[PDB]
Amino acid sequence: MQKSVLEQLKQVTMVVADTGDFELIKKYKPVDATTNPSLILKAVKEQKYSNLVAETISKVKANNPDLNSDDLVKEIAIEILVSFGIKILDVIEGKVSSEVDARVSFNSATTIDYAKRIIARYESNGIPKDRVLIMIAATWEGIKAAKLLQKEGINCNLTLIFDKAQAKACAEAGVYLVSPFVGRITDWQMQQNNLKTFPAIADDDGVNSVKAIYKLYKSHGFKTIVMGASFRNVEQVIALAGCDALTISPVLLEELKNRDEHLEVKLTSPQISEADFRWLMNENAMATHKLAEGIRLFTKDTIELENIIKQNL
């Protein structure tokens, strides 16, 4: 019963596919999947699912002849987000992550409203909320929004986690899952230290970040799921075998599928006030920069999606 590294990983970690390409999701059979604004933009622009995109735009237009261009564009954007999520849910047993508009990242109330709008759109298609994770950037405001959403039974994926303080604050808020990044932390490490080659696993700041969060969570008995995200190579993924969950790009899933060696299982202070959180984040130059950058990048891709929608009106 010898198995590939991918199949072995599934025994010790919840394998999640990081893509909007639902057909690819099929050849890897992950439990859950994650979409994000950049992945949705790629799914909209690529030829593969051009029919689905055109149909979604046409349907929303036909069913909302009274809405102005601006309101119509936002309606179409959320419908596209949800349409890809539904196609993904049709091919997996688990949940799909759908991200709120990045432009609401510093407003808890508008984050809550957008989250509820996403959930209502899934519900109108017969998808229960228990199959969806609302993805929210882990700014203080996003964590506050998630805290309230969880109280209403809406599970959240707190993303763009770069510091153990966010992770701790998210756990303290009772969120369903956190997505600490790995690759982007390693990117900063290489640029800051002028590293010509990729660091050894023991020295990889990204890998170590997830390990520290996992250790923190287990020692405190937190039930929030730790899902490593953002990977540069298969070695970083393999290094976190045993983590609660790992969301992995199709390119890397294919690499894992084709490897056959045994997979070694590697994974087996006061409450945070707003001022404390902000201080701790300020102390971390990398996290300060990367959280902000992540929000800007998703915003750029969401604005491009809006422009594309407007071009097809």
Ligand X SMILES: O=C(CO)[C@@H](O)[C@H](O)[C@H](O)[C@H](O)COP(=O)(O)O
Q: Which residues are at the interface with ligand X (CB under 6 A)? A: 18, 34, 36, 97, 135, 157, 159, 179, 183-184, 227, 229-230, 247
Residue 105 binds a second copy (CB under 8 A): yes
Residue 202 binds a second copy (CB under 8 A): no
Our CB check for a second copy shows the closer of 88 and 137 to be 137
* Residue 18 binding: pick among a second copy, ligand X, none (C-beta 5-8 Å cut-off by kind): ligand X
Exposed / middle / buried, residue 80 (Cβ in 10 Å: 0-12, 13-18, 19+): buried
245 bridge partner residues: 14, 227
Helix (H, G, I), strand (E, B) or coil at 249: coil
Longest dimension (CA), the chain: 60
* Residue 159 binding: pick among ligand X, a second copy, none (C-beta 5-8 Å cut-off by kind): ligand X
Distance CA 105, CA 4 (A): 39
* Residue 282 binding: pick among ligand X, a second copy, none (C-beta 5-8 Å cut-off by kind): a second copy
Q: Using only C-alpha atoms, what is the Rg of the chain?
A: 19
DSSP for 86-106, written as a single string:
HHHHTT-SS-EEEEPPGGGTT
Segment near a second copy (CB under 8 A); pick from 119-127, 164-172, 233-241, 272-280: 272-280
Ranges within 114-143 binding a second copy (CB under 8 A): 139, 141
Number of residues interacting with a second copy: please give it, by CB under 8 A.
20
Residue 50 binds a second copy (CB under 8 A): no
Residue 58 binds a second copy (CB under 8 A): no
Q: Which of 54, 195, 251, 285 binds a second copy (CB under 8 A)?
A: 285
Segment near a second copy (CB under 8 A); pick from 146-154, 171-179, 180-188, 287-295: 287-295
In the chain, the amino acid numbered 157 is N
- The answer to whether 17 touches 247, Cβ cutoff 8 Å, is yes
CB of 12 to a second copy, least distance (A): 37
* Residue 179 binding: pick among a second copy, ligand X, none (C-beta 5-8 Å cut-off by kind): ligand X
Dihedral Cα 253, 181, 246, 277, nearest 10 deg: -170
Our CB check for a second copy shows the closer of 254 and 293 to be 293
Report the 10 Å Cβ neighbour count for 270: 6
Residue 59 binds a second copy (CB under 8 A): no
End-to-end CA distance of the chain: 54
- For 196, phi then psi, to 5°, come to -80, -30
CB of 72 to ligand X, least distance (A): 27
Nearest one of 162, 266, 171, 155 to 218, comparing CA atoms: 171
Residues forming contacts to a second copy in the complex (CB under 8 A) are: 103, 105-107, 110, 139, 141, 274-275, 278-279, 282-283, 285, 288-289, 292-293, 295-296
